[PDB]
Amino acid sequence: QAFWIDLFETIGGGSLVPENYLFQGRQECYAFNGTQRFLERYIYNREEFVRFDSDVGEFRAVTELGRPDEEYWNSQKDILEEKRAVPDRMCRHNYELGGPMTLQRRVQPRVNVSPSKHNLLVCHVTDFYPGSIQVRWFLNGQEETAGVVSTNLIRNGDWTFQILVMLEMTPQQGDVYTCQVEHTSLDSPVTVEWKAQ
Amino acid sequence: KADHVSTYAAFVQTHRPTGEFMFEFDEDEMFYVDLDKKETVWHLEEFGQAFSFEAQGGLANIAILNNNLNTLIQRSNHTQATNDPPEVTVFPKEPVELGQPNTLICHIDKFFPPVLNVTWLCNGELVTEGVAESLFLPRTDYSFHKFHYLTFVPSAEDFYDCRVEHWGLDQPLLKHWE
Ligand SMILES: *[C@@H]1O[C@H](CO)[C@@H](O)[C@H](O)[C@H]1NC(C)=O
Ligand SMILES: *[C@@H]1O[C@H](CO)[C@@H](O)[C@H](O)[C@H]1NC(C)=O
Ligand SMILES: *[C@@H]1O[C@H](CO)[C@@H](O)[C@H](O)[C@H]1NC(C)=O
Numbered sequence: 001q002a003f004w005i006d007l008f009e010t011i012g013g014g015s016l017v018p019e020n021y022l023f024q025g026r027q028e029c030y031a032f033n034g035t036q037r038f039l040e041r042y043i044y045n046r047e048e049f050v051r052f053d054s055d056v057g058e059f060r061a062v063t064e065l066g067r068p069d070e071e072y073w074n075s076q077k078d079i080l081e082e083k084r085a086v087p088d089r090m091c092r093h094n095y096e097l098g099g100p101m102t103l104q105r106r107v108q109p110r111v112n113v114s115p116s117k118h119n120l121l122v123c124h125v126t127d128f129y130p131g132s133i134q135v136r137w138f139l140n141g142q143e144e145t146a147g148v149v150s151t152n153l154i155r156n157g158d159w160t161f162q163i164l165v166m167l168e169m170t171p172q173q174g175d176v177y178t179c180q181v182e183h184t185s186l187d188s189p190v191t192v193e194w195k196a197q
Numbered sequence: 198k199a200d201h202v203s204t205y206a207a208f209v210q211t212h213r214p215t216g217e218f219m220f221e222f223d224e225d226e227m228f229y230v231d232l233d234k235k236e237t238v239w240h241l242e243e244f245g246q247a248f249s250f251e252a253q254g255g256l257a258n259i260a261i262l263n264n265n266l267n268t269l270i271q272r273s274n275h276t277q278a279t280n281d282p283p284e285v286t287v288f289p290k291e292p293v294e295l296g297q298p299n300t301l302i303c304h305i306d307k308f309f310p311p312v313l314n315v316t317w318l319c320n321g322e323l324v325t326e327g328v329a330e331s332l333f334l335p336r337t338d339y340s341f342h343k344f345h346y347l348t349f350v351p352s353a354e355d356f357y358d359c360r361v362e363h364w365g366l367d368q369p370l371l372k373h374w375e
């Protein structure tokens with residue numbers, strides 16, 4: 001039930017003594033086929049100057065600014081041993097912990113079919129998770145592949161996505177257009193119809 | 198190369214917000230340590246009911262990062278980075294239907310530093326209610342992004358604008374969607 005952190009390393013200033021300065025730190029866990037790779041990044045403003053990579057097993061200077069930090073931190077066998085332990089310690093721990101609510105998170109898409117403001121038919125697929133989604137257009141049961149524009153996958157910033165899929169249509173009376181959405185949160189595909197009239 | 202990327206991202210600066218400590222799963226913020234109230238804030242109710250994170254772990258990391266900041270201000274001989282202006286986009290959460298509730302999303306992207314002023318305007322009038330915002334989300338390119346939200350009821354007489362002030366912008370960026 002508890003997420004684990006590891007403390008960032010200290011760059012000592014020593015003892016001797018609009019305007020803006022920024023420092024950014026990142027602890028990145030890359031999960032892949034059971035494996036865990038850990039990267040610890042030290043950034044001054046937009047400049048990553050030093051980093052720990054589990055595939056290297058030590059700190060390496062990204063720019064000349066991080067040369068004192070590579071030299072110093074690598075001479076501390078205690079720092080190296082705790083960083084090397086991260087993939088199996090926090091990376092693996094947090095990934096297993098945050099499993100049912102993250103990788104096993106499945107939120108169903110809401111589908112709306114409406115003609116545009118070359119007549120265009122808009123399939124607005126909204127509020128779903130994960131991002132991977134299949135949207136297919138059909139006219140009287142036959143799939144329409146040409147004249148189809150799929151927007152970029154839109155991240156809402158609230159743990160949901162949205163996508164707009166539009167088709168170039170030439171509608172006759174009685175024509176039935178169908179937007180078919182397939183997603184990991186759905187047992188059977190979702191189908192929304194539009195009658196030309 | 199990964200199926201999933203879990204990252205703790207923290208920043209510390211001279212201007213407001215002075216610091217930020219957060220955890221993201223696949224570029225989405227799961228939780229953050231509110232530095233002012235000094236407590237863990239979970240993005241979704243479900244994350245809080247299932248998990249826990251001790252606030253002291255964030256606060257301690259901010260302290261370490263602040264020490265590293267001061268050392269680098271000295272080392273870099275007071276190097277201030279160039280102000281990188283944002284790219285703004287306004288889009289609704291749901292397909293628009295006149296009279297039916299919706300959320301307008303203002304997505305401010307590719308900016309540095311994470312210092313910004315964002316206002317919602319309806320017909321040239323400042324809007325204070327129904328407003329919400331995300332944190333300064335750290336991008337993999339060491340730039341930032343942010344989300345601003347406005348809950349509204351679509352009206353053909355109501356014109357919404359998202360105004361953003363940033364040091365890299367001489368004039369404020371004014372973006373819209375009906
Ligand atoms: C890891 O991935 C490789 C293919 O990239 C696969 O052959 C292997 O079975 C996977 N798991 C293990 C235990 O090596
Ligand atoms: C800071 O200035 C000194 C000269 O006084 C120079 O030797 C040093 O390399 C400078 N460092 C940076 C990062 O500009
Ligand atoms: C934000 O607004 C305040 C006044 O409310 C001002 O001091 C500051 O310079 C503004 N500009 C930016 C880009 O933050």
Ligand SMILES: [Ca+2]
Pocket residue numbers: 007008009010079
């Ligand atoms: Ca340490």
